[PDB]
Ligand binder design. Structure first.
Ligand SMILES: [Cl-]
Lengths: 93, 99
């Protein structure tokens, strides 16, 4: 019960990750990929991705540290933007 | 028209994620856009969903309770999909629509 419905690390280096997700059948306005150390207090970074892509590269990670990667998808309709339930994963570089 | 459960406009959280995998009574309907004549439906059941809307008047019939209704809308969705007075059941499949 989230959009996108799947999320995976496809490729990995000690400092970067390639993540993919299953795009939904409906039109995504745009994605937001967020990521931060699973520790908690360590500043959560984020960037946006066009609603037409289903992949993204996250770089500049601390090697060996466990981060949490979250992908949100937006719906835009009737002059209102709104966010589906996100999908998130834990990965240790 | 179309048929096939409607599919007009979109919205309502992408039609509950196109039905969220399906089940219960399924669903469909639609509406919104810049107006679209009003709109509604939804559906679901066990796994969530809901919806509603409908409405109408002003010579145009409609429904969604109100002691029956009518005047189009696929005969009020085939008479609720065969019961389902105030929602909470009825419908009877729909979906597809990009699925
Ligand atoms: Cl029909």
């Amino acid at each position: 019960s989230s959009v996108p419905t799947k999320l995976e690390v496809v490729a990995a280096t000690p400092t970067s990750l390639l993540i993919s997700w299953d795009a939904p059948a409906v039109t995504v306005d745009h994605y937001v990929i967020t990521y931060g150390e699973t520790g908690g207090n360590s500043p959560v970074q984020e960037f946006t991705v066009p609603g037409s892509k289903s992949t993204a590269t996250i770089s500049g990670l601390k090697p060996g540290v466990d981060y949490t990667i979250t992908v949100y998808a937006s719906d835009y309709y009737d002059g209102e933007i709104s966010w589906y339930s996100p999908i998130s994963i834990n990965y240790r570089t | 028209x179309x048929x096939x459960x409607x599919x007009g406009x979109x919205x309502x959280x992408x039609x509950x994620x196109x039905x969220x995998x399906g089940x219960x009574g399924x669903x469909x309907x639609x509406x919104x856009x810049x107006x679209x004549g009003x709109x509604x439906x939804x559906x679901x059941x066990x796994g969530x969903x809901x919806x509603x809307x409908x409405x109408x008047x002003x010579x145009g019939x409609x429904x969604x309770x109100x002691x029956x209704x009518x005047x189009x809308x696929x005969x009020x969705x085939x008479x609720x999909x065969x019961x389902x007075x105030g929602x909470x059941x009825x419908x009877x499949x729909x979906x597809x629509x990009x699925x």
